[PDB]
Design a protein around this ligand. Structure first.
Ligand code: HEM
Length: 154
């Protein structure tokens, strides 16, 4: 697929608001993901013991990972589709070390859209959400193709 410039503008305009507080957005998203799809928590050896949202909110490590995850995603979105290099090491570790199925990337994509929708309603109307969804679908489609070359496709 290919986004237009206008669509990228809508995606990078709401992302600039996320970047004003990357750790808080990273916490919200990861907790929204673990609450909605608890099975995903299991993939995190360091955090699967967390039992409640209060514990999750208090975890320093969880917050640090949230910032790592959003910072990588931001770097990929800022490429505007030219993200082959950035996707290579990401695909290799998620397909070979962590083993994250494509279905779980669809789950965090839903959590990202849920959190932008509640924290940035003014900059995340229907056109901006459709553009963000297209951008994450592009990201998933290119990651799934890399998974396949790497021998995992999950
Ligand atoms: C927006 C999509 C995502 C991005 C951009 C992303 C990015 C990252 C990055 C940059 C790291 C650290 C370096 C490396 O291990 O590659 C990481 C680690 C990891 N990610 Fe992802 N990730 C995403 C989705 C997920 C999903 C959906 C899961 C599980 C449901 C997941 C599981 C993990 C695990 C288990 C680690 C290692 C954590 C630790 O340090 O112990 N990631 N991810």
């Amino acid at each position: 697929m290919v986004l237009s410039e206008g669509e990228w503008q809508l995606v990078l305009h709401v992302w600039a608001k996320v970047e004003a507080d990357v750790a808080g957005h990273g916490q919200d998203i990861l907790i929204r993901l673990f609450k909605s799809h608890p099975e995903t928590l299991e993939k995190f050896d360091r955090f699967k013991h967390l039992k409640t949202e209060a514990e999750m909110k208090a975890s320093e490590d969880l917050k640090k990972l949230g910032v790592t995850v959003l910072t990588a995603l931001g770097a990929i979105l800022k490429k505007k589709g030219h993200h082959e290099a950035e996707l290579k090491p990401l695909a290799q570790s998620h397909a070979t070390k962590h083993k994250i199925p494509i279905k779980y990337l669809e789950f965090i994509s839903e959590a990202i859209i849920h959190v932008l929708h509640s924290r940035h309603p003014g900059n995340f109307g229907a056109d901006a959400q459709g553009a963000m969804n297209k951008a994450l679908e592009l990201f998933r489609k290119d990651i799934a193709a890399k998974y396949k070359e790497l021998g995992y496709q999950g």
